Design a protein around this ligand. Structure first.
Ligand SMILES: Nc1ncnc2c1ncn2[C@@H]1O[C@H](COP(=O)(O)OP(=O)(O)NP(=O)(O)O)[C@@H](O)[C@H]1O
Ligand SMILES: Nc1ncnc2c1ncn2[C@@H]1O[C@H](COP(=O)(O)OP(=O)(O)NP(=O)(O)O)[C@@H](O)[C@H]1O
Ligand SMILES: [Mg+2]
Ligand SMILES: [Mg+2]
Ligand SMILES: [Mg+2]
Ligand SMILES: [Mg+2]
Lengths: 387, 392
């Protein structure tokens, strides 16, 4: 009997617990680690706004994860809603301070869902906040607030979010250290003044497993890192910026004797690992710049076909970092940046700055074009040899 | 700065479809070409879901001149009756997020729709929406202007059942509001392949600057050979290496799988993955389960027949999948898709399942057809040694 009785409306966090995949992709290792990503993003968002300097993540013994920032602290006062803003932010969907650019000019967070999902997919969530001249505490048991508590007075500011992933939701709740270590590192690469500390408290003087991430050389350091094991082909690491009405691009790149593509893209510090408009404008601009150089330096005949992106990006270590005041991310996992205006923006920046670099550095330009030409001709030889 | 004085007032709660209008990327990916087409997917997906349940036989998609899209199914009809919340059910289904009849397995046992978001999002990102429902003994008509319902109208009596949804994309939302016929065509074609008793008709009533009948693009997709008509389609411009196509299925608790595969002359991998008819073009567990199974099956066959030497390492997936045309269709009672755009299927248990079915059933095909198998193994053996030669 398909009718009005079959239509079911979901309320609050019901929808998150019924369809975790809509918010975290899946309940696998990727989904589990996304919980950490949601809590850390909010702390990073505070650093980007220029309030936090430090983000400390701790993998606790019990499987709990702690994330502490020295930012402004989650608004704790009573909302217009009639409940303390901590609860609005922690238990409601499409609720937050990132629907404008007033509180956070450039922020990874934008849907007002992130940390609410973490509450929804956790057995427990604790929060310790410093602001309004006090130390504030709140416990959320099976997503429900047990009571906001006004504690010790303090001039200090910041937030500390603690959460315990539901073993009913996730199959495996053991977080992976090096997965977390890798992501926190890239956040510090995209945030110059930011310091991220990581501690693994899970199982006479004893030192606990820890890492510190501070990179004053930003993206140029990120590239040096990518090209440690890989043997760099040219001395000068490409580095440039681009500014526009509503957006900004930051690029750094270097080639190596490798045969793989090591291109990482970011939008408001978010790892847009499935790419997007920013990556697309970059690839587009790169292919056209190299192809013009090779044709102009007669490294390819006029009858010779143009070098494909695959030939050029082979052995390339590149980082594309965009700061967008109004991003368009593909779902809550934000695997892609979709902003159509950002493709034409990145493209003109890469076109004008890569054309500049290739003409300014003739030594370095020669090598990377020689590689592209040699890798292109190799694929034309391998296809013919196979017949 | 007012950023310093950030507190309770800085936090704002979005009500209903304001969430979709503010952050469309959460539900459609982007406001680009791919996002625009996603609006048709949401509406067609709902019509297809009715075919999957065995109530709809036909789906008719029309790209209107004005710029609107019309999707007509002969299903059961979007329930019209006044919902428990106090308003007609159509209005709940069209103006409210996380509301639908796909949260259980009662109305739709297997369905691509699962979030209760689809058609509400379409309504949210459209200047106007129009619904024509035939059910409960009468033909009904509702109109939404900027998502707001103008009032449900009751019409003439009918014994027939179906739904007709018509939407006009908001140009303020989308950079481009003009659809690509081939994009729509290709998709509706794959939908017809994965649903044996379904017929999808696409019609293009958009003119170009007289109105001769041949100037209107049209398609009618009905494939009784399902996935086999799909692999036959894939290897058309390409040339098959073995005569008979690999056709096999396999069921489990709360999941079913269908595989159809064939190898071509090229070095081009053409593996298409589907979950509840949804094109999971980024793959997921079902694909990964198949990829694992396929690599293991060929490596056990190449070693036993001694086609591959003991000295050389095992074959890579890429060399096996080189020139492979395959279709992977899973039917899952409780799926887990990455977001609204549903680009990936992430069910942990599906990787084990598809691999279990593939490992067992492919081994069966290799053992029963040694003649066709030798050609396949010989292709992978040469392409692996080609990859080794290229590295030198
Ligand atoms: N560590 C924090 N410091 C200060 N404010 C925070 C912090 N964490 C959360 N908030 C506030 O709570 C709001 C909502 O967070 P959240 O639930 O993650 O959604 P969001 O960050 O706005 N967007 P999104 O992450 O894309 O879903 C934020 O806008 C912040 O204002
Ligand atoms: N053509 C139709 N025929 C009958 N019922 C429909 C039709 N279209 C929508 N519905 C019903 O309306 C509900 C809401 O639609 P929708 O917004 O697309 O959410 P959904 O299909 O459940 N899931 P999803 O598409 O993944 O967000 C559906 O679940 C159906 O119950
Ligand atoms: Mg913002
Ligand atoms: Mg957030
Ligand atoms: Mg019917
Ligand atoms: Mg739908």
């Amino acid at each position: 009997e398909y009718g009005a009785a079959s239509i079911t409306i979901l309320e609050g966090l019901e929808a998150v617990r019924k369809r975790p995949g809509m918010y975290i992709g899946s309940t696998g290792e990727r989904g589990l680690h996304h919980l950490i990503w949601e809590v850390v993003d909010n702390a990073v968002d505070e650093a980007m706004a220029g309030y936090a300097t430090t983000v400390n993540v701790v993998l606790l013994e019990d499987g709990g994860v702690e994330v502490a920032d020295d930012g402004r602290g989650i608004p704790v006062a009573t909302h217009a809603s009639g409940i303390p803003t901590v609860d609005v932010v922690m238990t409601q969907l499409h609720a937050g301070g990132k629907f404008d650019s007033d509180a956070y000019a450039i922020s990874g967070g934008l849907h007002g869902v992130g940390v609410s999902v973490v509450n929804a997919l956790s057995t427990r969530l604790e929060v310790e906040i410093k602001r309004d001249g006090y130390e504030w505490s709140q416990v959320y048991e099976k997503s429900e607030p047990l009571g906001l508590k006004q504690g010790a007075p303090t001039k200090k500011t910041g937030s500390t979010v603690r959460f315990w992933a539901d073993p009913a939701v996730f199959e495996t709740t053991e977080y992976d250290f090096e997965t977390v270590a890798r992501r926190l590192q890239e956040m510090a690469f995209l945030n110059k003044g930011l310091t991220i500390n990581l501690t693994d408290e899970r199982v006479a003087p004893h030192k606990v497993k820890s890492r510190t991430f501070h990179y004053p050389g930003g993206l140029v350091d990120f590239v040096k890192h990518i090209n440690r094991t890989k043997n760099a082909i040219h001395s000068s690491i490409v580095d440039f910026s681009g500014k526009g009405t509503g957006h900004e691009v930051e690029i750094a790149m270097q080639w190596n004797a490798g045969y793989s593509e090591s291109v990482h893209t970011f939008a408001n510090t978010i790892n847009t690992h499935e790419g997007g408009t920013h990556e697309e404008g970059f690839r587009s601009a790169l292919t056209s710049v190299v192809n013009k150089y090779a044709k102009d330096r007669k490294l390819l005949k006029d009858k010779d076909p143009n070098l494909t992106g695959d030939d050029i990006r082979e052995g390339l270590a590149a980082v594309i970092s965009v700061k967008v005041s109004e991003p368009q991310f593909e779902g809550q996992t934000k695997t892609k940046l979709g902003n159509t205006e950002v493709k034409s923006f990145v493209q003109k920046v890469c076109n004008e700055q890569l054309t500049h670099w290739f003409e300014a550095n003739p030594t370095d330009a020669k090598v990377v074009v020689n590689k592209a030409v040699s890798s292109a001709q190799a694929r034309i030889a391998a296809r013919k040899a196979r017949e």
